[PDB]
């Protein structure tokens, strides 16, 4: 989703992440990046489950994000970083114990800076929006 992180507000995240099309909302980390000729895969671990969907995954379990190689320069996924990823349930690929996901055009990937990295003035607004995002969907959920 090519909306910029400065152009999106907290209320835009509240409107987009509470849609019934959007199935999963997670703040997570990634472990392994495997680069292949067909598609690049990301073994990725659950840090929090902000909004669980049709996949029953627990905190600390690992899943796989599949992206095409042309998005490898576009995603800019660096290892041991935190990312906010949401999206729809149409990106189911495998079966239930071996579920794989697809980074589609409707998949929201955002850089989540760390707790020390919130101390910068450039990352203050993003940390405030993402903290109020977590404190709105974890504690109170999504209305309608």
Curated annotation (Swiss-Prot):
Superkingdom of the organism of origin: Eukaryota
Annotated site residues (Coordinates Mg(2+) for interaction with Complement factor B Bb fragment (CFB)) in this chain: 144
Residue(s) carrying Phosphoserine: 54
Domain spans labelled NTR: 1-142
Region (Interaction with CFP/properdin): 115-140
Cystines in this chain: 18-142, 118-127
Residues bearing glycans: 98
Protein's recorded name: Complement C3c alpha' chain fragment 2
Organism, scientific name: Homo sapiens (Human)
């Amino acid at each position: 989703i090519q909306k910029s992180d400065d152009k999106v507000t907290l209320e835009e995240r509240l409107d987009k992440a509470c849609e019934p099309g959007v199935d999963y909302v997670y703040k997570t980390r990634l472990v392994k990046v495997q680069l292949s000729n067909d598609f690049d895969e990301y073994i990725m671990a659950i840090e929090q489950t902000i909004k669980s969907g049709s996949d029953e995954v627990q905190v600390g379990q690992q899943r796989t994000f599949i992206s095409p190689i042309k998005c490898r320069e576009a995603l800019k996924l660096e290892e041991k970083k935190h990312y906010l990823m949401w999206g729809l349930s149409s990106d189911f690929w495998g079966e239930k114990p071996n579920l794989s996901y697809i980074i589609g055009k409707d998949t929201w990937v955002e850089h989540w800076p760390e707790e020390d990295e919130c101390q910068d003035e450039e990352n203050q607004k993003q940390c405030q929006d993402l903290g109020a995002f977590t404190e709105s969907m974890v504690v109170f959920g999504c209305p309608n």
